[PDB]
Enzyme design. Structure first.
Site, PDB file in Angstrom:
ATOM      1  N   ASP A  45      -4.216   6.544  -4.472  1.00 15.33           N
ATOM      2  CA  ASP A  45      -3.905   7.860  -5.009  1.00 15.33           C
ATOM      3  C   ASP A  45      -4.150   7.895  -6.514  1.00 15.33           C
ATOM      4  OD1 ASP A  45      -2.916   8.063  -2.400  1.00 15.33           O
ATOM      5  OD2 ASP A  45      -1.391   9.508  -3.021  1.00 15.33           O
ATOM      6  N   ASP A  78       0.852  -1.179   0.000  1.00 14.19           N
ATOM      7  CA  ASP A  78       0.000   0.000   0.000  1.00 14.19           C
ATOM      8  C   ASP A  78       0.892   1.234   0.000  1.00 14.19           C
ATOM      9  OD1 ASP A  78      -2.177   1.880   0.454  1.00 14.19           O
ATOM     10  OD2 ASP A  78      -1.702   1.784   2.582  1.00 14.19           O
ATOM     11  N   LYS A  79       0.464   2.289  -0.692  1.00 14.49           N
ATOM     12  CA  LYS A  79       1.356   3.427  -0.896  1.00 14.49           C
ATOM     13  C   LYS A  79       1.342   4.388   0.287  1.00 14.49           C
ATOM     14  CE  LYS A  79       1.231   7.722  -3.373  1.00 14.49           C
ATOM     15  NZ  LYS A  79       2.437   8.141  -2.615  1.00 14.49           N
ATOM     16  N   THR A  80       0.195   4.998   0.572  1.00 11.08           N
ATOM     17  CA  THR A  80       0.134   6.069   1.561  1.00 11.08           C
ATOM     18  C   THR A  80       0.084   5.484   2.964  1.00 11.08           C
ATOM     19  OG1 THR A  80      -1.149   7.313  -0.063  1.00 11.08           O
ATOM     20  CG2 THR A  80      -0.949   8.231   2.142  1.00 11.08           C
ATOM     21  N   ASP A 132      -1.618  -0.142   6.280  1.00  9.63           N
ATOM     22  CA  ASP A 132      -1.869   0.504   7.562  1.00  9.63           C
ATOM     23  C   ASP A 132      -3.238   1.153   7.696  1.00  9.63           C
ATOM     24  OD1 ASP A 132      -1.522   2.769   5.901  1.00  9.63           O
ATOM     25  OD2 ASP A 132      -0.750   3.934   7.593  1.00  9.63           O
ATOM     26  N   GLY A 133      -3.978   1.366   6.612  1.00 10.10           N
ATOM     27  CA  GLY A 133      -5.201   2.136   6.665  1.00 10.10           C
ATOM     28  C   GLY A 133      -6.417   1.296   6.997  1.00 10.10           C
ATOM     29  N   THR A 134      -7.583   1.917   6.822  1.00 10.11           N
ATOM     30  CA  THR A 134      -8.859   1.257   7.053  1.00 10.11           C
ATOM     31  C   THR A 134      -9.472   0.680   5.786  1.00 10.11           C
ATOM     32  OG1 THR A 134      -9.185   3.024   8.676  1.00 10.11           O
ATOM     33  CG2 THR A 134     -11.001   1.494   8.342  1.00 10.11           C
ATOM     34  N   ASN A 135      -9.064   1.160   4.611  1.00 10.04           N
ATOM     35  CA  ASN A 135      -9.645   0.668   3.369  1.00 10.04           C
ATOM     36  C   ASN A 135      -9.102  -0.699   2.981  1.00 10.04           C
ATOM     37  OD1 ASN A 135      -7.207   2.038   3.105  1.00 10.04           O
ATOM     38  ND2 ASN A 135      -7.523   2.413   0.918  1.00 10.04           N
ATOM     39  N   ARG A 193       2.599  18.840  -5.708  1.00 12.75           N
ATOM     40  CA  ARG A 193       1.516  19.816  -5.762  1.00 12.75           C
ATOM     41  C   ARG A 193       2.129  21.208  -5.693  1.00 12.75           C
ATOM     42  NH1 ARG A 193      -1.874  22.639  -1.898  1.00 12.75           N
ATOM     43  NH2 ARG A 193      -0.582  21.770  -0.215  1.00 12.75           N
TER      44      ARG A 193
HETATM   45  F1  BEF Z   1      -2.832   4.115   0.005  1.00  9.81           F
HETATM   46 BE1  BEF Z   1      -3.077   2.772   0.763  1.00  9.81          BE
HETATM   47  F2  BEF Z   1      -4.401   2.181   0.231  1.00  9.81           F
HETATM   48  F3  BEF Z   1      -3.149   2.953   2.284  1.00  9.81           F
HETATM   49 MG    MG Z   2      -2.580   3.420   3.942  1.00  3.70          MG
END
Ligand code: BEF
Ligand code: MG
Length: 1092
Positions: A675, A470-472, A792-795, A617
């Site tokens: 993203d 996962d990227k972010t 690390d995220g919720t998605n 950005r």
């Molecule tokens: F960008 Be990943 F889906 F946390």
């Molecule tokens: Mg994430």
């Protein structure tokens, strides 16, 4: 009767509890017991035995299946006012069936039947006679006036509390008894209790009870460890914090648990380790949320109010009106109070007021987590191993039974021998060995703060074929950081040039500090967009209470008047003054500023398009000299270019090396992000996932009609595509370009014939929804590959759960964790904290550190664990075959050993067998992967050939000894131990065989450290080899005499020594033969990397 009406349920039947007498097993049995008592008042005792067994089985029949339990214990009824349990038949895609208890309570003079299935509430509606879940107003089509005109709750809300419940996230943990019931099904445990029962049938009581207690204690400790891990790491970090709520026409401060739909709240700038409570909708104000956790993107979004929209006609769409919604689980970086007055007083804080829409598990984050928890879904190797052992035991038992009935022994002794064979088919020290191995693996993982809650997935990390990312939040940080200026030049010598910091001319350092919106309060604080604060600190500006900012190192500067940032015509401005003259600074989007200033530079467009097409950005600022309160179009009449400002989330300092180490180790690593495709492609190219030119699949136009388009990062190649007629031309697409599929292209390609051919050749997926990562991982598993997910995220919670091995990276450094541990130790004696989030709730492994090398460490430990498992299985197979042959054949001859020989041999060989597990893996990763399973040509051939070599050696030496001494055809099995020559001639070779079966098979070099570095087993084997070789050539007459060994001749000594050496060397040589000819350790077809 009752009929639950919900998309989760399919059917439902009520249940009333039956008495302790009408149970199905009990009534029929009393006639059988009376018949047995009459017949009794030898052969009849087995009848009482099997009757008691069948009775106890009938009683335990219900517990396995809930359908059988509901059929036996409860009888269905048709009156909802008397049933106290209800059976729920779930849909095919939602969890499993179950039994839930019908509760009752009287409020406002009326009883309200209700229960709660899968964290989804139900209630009893008499008008339709159905249990119906609540339906919120936002789901039904609302007029926007209904939201605009609301004025908070009033009166006594004792019914809303029942209908909607409390806004609370409480995840259930399993109890100890069910967790033990899960372990008590495993084949090894049932085999162990079966064998100890078989032995207790005739042996002592103390030994059997001690063995059973020692078996139970291991499972107790294992379940305790797993339960502690679950209790710690199975929760989402949610702590209530006080906010203001409009109730009874006055602003009163409530908590976060007491929120209901259509309740007015006032949200402020969210502090650290906190989030927005629930799904809110802006009713007045503005905010800048950060969707990095839930949605998974980097840039902070700008939300707006809902008041300006027309009230009557328009409908709340969540389309065009998506700029007003606020999910739950995101941080709000900045909020602005309402501008004008309404029919309610403004909040006491400076926050903006908003409306609640959904609370509890019915919000987006709650829905994702609930569907993960409840809607969730080989052992054939162990079964085949058990069947193999049983087949050989049965062969040996048949032989010994025929020989016993031929010799003329009683049936009792033959039964005892056939029981002893199956009891000794497995070594007694297997449970301790398994427990030591598991605990060693866990305590070796836990030194990098990698806590695991399912220890049976560590062997899964050995043969990983695809590593998803996962990227972010995982590979990059989630905040924008200032990188430096760009574009303030006219030489055109290089486009990509960053004047890192403090290298600007006077104009740029004046403008960066004059054009901002920060302000210092009276009590001491600073408010504003955190990116503005970041750049103002990086350039080195300091703001004071008065709007004048100074102490930068060169002089002072004051601001006269500042303007706002509108959503449309996005830009800002400011009017500042200096000791020399007066100027006006302007900072906005580059494209809008470009049309404003007169002197258009030459590289403006080139630099803008070069820094925007890759993640960053930009923000283009400009100024203008103003000689000595006016309008807005006059100050922004014409400007002068003064520089760019480039922001992008930075990579983790550990991602590049980790991905390189995973690439040089026959792994395939892909990226599944949320993203935009440009930033995803840029980060994947910088890290090392893609190498050559990259193509992107996205929508061709704007409106509709599902027409994808292969489009480069730049505007060079535009290959059109049509998911209705065309097909992937591999030789022209996949060989020349690495392609990256977006979410829309993956959605419009469903049902295509070449979807899997596509998924085989794509390494980057951008803009995918939380429900498509599950589909991607399920397809990658159905193809035949072993997967891994590190997010690390919720998605990405469902992807973390569905993968073969999931990892959840938290936040924290080594220094902070060490300091926290030391402080905890000091508190028990006499850096920002970490948040548990929602990704650690589904991932088995949870790396409490932030770096990415946790994946490499986990794979390095999984290789060693799998190697240990395979070696233990092979050694167990060999020892079982050798013991079965030894008993079955030898025992039918006149061979009986003393006591001291057996004692010393057993002690040393048990020390070796327990030291098998301890081994430290190598710090490097190799391209060869360990074997999976014992059943294949290589391992089976090696085992059978080593058994054949041992048999040949033993047969030859037995023939030689029978040549020395007479054969003694008549044999008796009651004669005690007596010093003989067959005794020693068999015992020495048993010792040497038990040494060889370890020394030949243990050694694994590429996966773990050498045998010599394992001091325990090395010293054990050296001791036993010295003992055997000192007993064979009688190098020490005192030692030979002390151990009850008969003196031997010379020719027999020579023959015995040569036989031992030839046995060992032949075993080793044939093992190496099979290893050289049939290894077959091949990386997957997707793991190979070719130059495109
Ligand atoms: F960008 Be990943 F889906 F946390
Ligand atoms: Mg994430």
């Amino acid at each position: 009767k009752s009929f639950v009406s919900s998309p989760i349920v399919r059917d439902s039947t009520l249940l009333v509890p039956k008495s302790l007498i009408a149970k199905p097993y009990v009534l029929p049995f009393f006639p059988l017991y009376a018949t047995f008592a009459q017949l009794y008042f030898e052969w009849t005792f087995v009848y009482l035995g099997t009757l008691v067994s069948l009775n106890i089985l009938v009683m335990l029949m219900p517990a396995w299946n809930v359908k059988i339990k509901a059929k036996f214990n409860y009888s269905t009824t048709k009156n909802v006012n008397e049933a106290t349990h209800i059976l729920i038949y779930t849909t095919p895609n939602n969890g499993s069936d179950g039994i839930v208890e019908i509760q009752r309570v009287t409020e406002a003079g009326s009883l309200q039947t209700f229960f709660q299935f899968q964290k989804k509430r139900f209630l009893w509606h008499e008008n339709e006679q159905v249990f119906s879940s609540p339906k919120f107003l936002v789901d039904e089509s609302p007029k926007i006036g209904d939201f605009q005109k609301c004025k908070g709750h009033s009166g006594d809300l004792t019914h809303l509390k029942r209908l909607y419940g409390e806004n609370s996230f409480d995840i259930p943990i399993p109890t100890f008894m069910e967790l033990f019931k899960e372990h008590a099904v495993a084949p090894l445990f049932v085999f162990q209790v079966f064998c100890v029962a078989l032995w207790l049938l005739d042996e002592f009581w103390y030994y059997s009870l001690f063995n059973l207690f020692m078996i139970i204690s291991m499972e107790a400790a294992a379940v305790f460890q797993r339960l502690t891990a679950l209790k710690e790491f199975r929760t989402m970090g949610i702590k209530p914090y006080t906010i203001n709520v409009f109730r009874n026409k006055k602003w009163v401060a409530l908590q976060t648990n007491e929120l209901l739909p259509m309740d007015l709240v006032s949200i402020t700038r969210t502090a650290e380790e906190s989030a927005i409570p629930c799904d809110l909708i802006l009713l007045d104000g503005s905010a800048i949320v950060n969707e990095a956790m839930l949605s998974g993107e980097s840039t902070p979004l700008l939300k707006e109010s809902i008041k300006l929209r027309p009230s009557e006609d328009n409908l709340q769409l969540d389309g065009v009106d998506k700029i007003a919604v606020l999910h739950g689980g995101t941080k709000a970086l900045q909020v602005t109070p309402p501008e004008h007055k309404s029919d309610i007083p403004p909040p006491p804080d400076g926050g903006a007021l908003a409306i609640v829409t959904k609370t509890g598990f019915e919000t987006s984050q709650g829905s994702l987590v609930r569907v993960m928890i409840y809607s969730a879904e080989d052992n054939k190797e162990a079964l085949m191993f058990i069947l193999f052992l049983l087949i050989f035991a049965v062969i040996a038992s048949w032989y010994v039974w025929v020989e016993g009935t031929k010799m003329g022994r009683i049936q009792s002794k033959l039964i005892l021998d056939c029981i002893l064979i199956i009891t000794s088919v497995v070594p007694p020290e297997l449970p301790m060995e398994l427990t030591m191995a598991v605990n060693s693996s866990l305590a070796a993982l836990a030194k990098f703060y990698v806590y695991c809650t399912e220890p049976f997935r560590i062997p899964f990390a050995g043969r990983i074929d695809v590593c998803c990312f996962d990227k972010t939040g995982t590979l990059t940080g989630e905040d924008l950081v200032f990188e430096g200026l760009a574009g303030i030049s006219a030489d055109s010598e290089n486009i990509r040039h960053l004047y890192s910091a403090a290298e600007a001319p006077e104009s740029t350092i004046l403008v960066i500090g004059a054009a901002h919106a920060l302000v210092k309060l009276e009590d001491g604080d600073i408010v504003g967009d955190p990116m503005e604060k970041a750049t103002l600190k990086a350039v080195g500006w300091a703001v004071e209470r008065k709007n004048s900012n100074y102490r930068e190192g060169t002089g002072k500067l004051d601001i006269i008047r500042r303007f706002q940032f509108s959503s449309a015509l996005k830009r800002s401005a400011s009017i500042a003054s200096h000791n020399d003259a007066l100027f006006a600074a302007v900072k906005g989007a580059p494209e809008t500023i470009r049309e404003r200033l007169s002197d258009i530079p030459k590289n403006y467009d080139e630099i803008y398009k070069s820094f925007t097409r890759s993640g960053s950005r930009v923000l283009a600022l400009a100024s203008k000299s103003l000689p000595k309160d006016l309008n807005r179009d006059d100050v922004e009449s014409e400007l002068t270019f003064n520089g760019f400002l480039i922001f992008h989330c930075p990579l983790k300092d550990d991602a590049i090396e980790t991905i390189k180490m995973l690439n040089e180790s026959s792994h395939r690593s892909i990226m599944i992000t949320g993203d935009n495709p440009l930033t995803a492609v840029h980060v994947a190219k910088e890290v090392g996932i893609v190498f050559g030119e990259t193509l992107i699949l996205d929508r061709a136009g704007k409106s509709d009609d599902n027409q994808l388009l292969f489009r480069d990062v730049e505007e060079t190649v535009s290959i059109p595509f049509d998911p209705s007629k065309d097909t992937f031309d591999h030789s022209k697409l996949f060989d020349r370009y690495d392609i990256a599929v977006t979410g829309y292209a993956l959605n419009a390609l469903e049902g295509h014939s070449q979807l899997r051919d596509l998924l085989r050749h794509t390494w980057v997926y951008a803009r995918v929804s939380p429900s498509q990562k599950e589909f991607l991982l399920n397809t990658l598993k159905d193809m035949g590959y072993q997967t891994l997910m590190c997010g690390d995220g919720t998605n990405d919670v469902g992807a973390l759960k569905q993968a073969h091995v999931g990892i959840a990276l938290l936040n924290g450094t080594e220094e902070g964790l060490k300091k926290l541990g030391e402080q905890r130790r000091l508190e028990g004696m006499k850096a920002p904290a970490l948040k548990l989030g929602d990704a650690s709730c589904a991932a088995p492994f949870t790396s409490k550190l932030a770096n990415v090398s946790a994946v490499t460490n986990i794979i390095r430990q999984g290789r060693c664990a799998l190697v240990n498992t395979i070696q233990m299985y092979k050694i167990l197979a060999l020892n079982c075959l050798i013991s079965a042959y030894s008993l079955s054949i030898i025992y039918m001859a006149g061979v009986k050993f003393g006591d001291g020989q057996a004692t010393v041999s057993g002690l040393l060989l048990s020390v070796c067998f327990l030291s098998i597990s301890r081994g430290k893996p190598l710090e490097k990763l190799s391209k060869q992967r360990p074997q999976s399973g014992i059943f294949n040509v290589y391992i089976m051939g090696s085992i059978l050939s080593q058994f054949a070599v041992h048999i040949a050696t033993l047969v030859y030496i037995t023939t030689e000894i029978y040549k020395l001494e007479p054969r003694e055809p008549q044999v008796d099995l009651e004669k005690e131990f007596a010093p003989s020559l067959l005794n020693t001639g068999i015992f020495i070779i048993q010792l040497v065989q038990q040494v060889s079966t370890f020394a030949v098979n243990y050694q694994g070099e590429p996966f773990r450290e050498n045998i010599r570095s394992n001091k325990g087993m090395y010293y054990g084997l050296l001791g036993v080899t010295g003992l055997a070789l000192a007993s064979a050539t009688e190098f020490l007459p005192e030692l030979n005499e002390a151990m009850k060994f008969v003196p031997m001749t010379d020719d027999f000594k020579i023959k015995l020594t040569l036989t031992l050496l030839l046995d060992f060397f032949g075993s080793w040589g044939v093992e190496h033969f099979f290893k050289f000819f049939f290894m077959d350790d091949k990386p997957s077809d997707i793991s190979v990397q070719q130059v495109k």
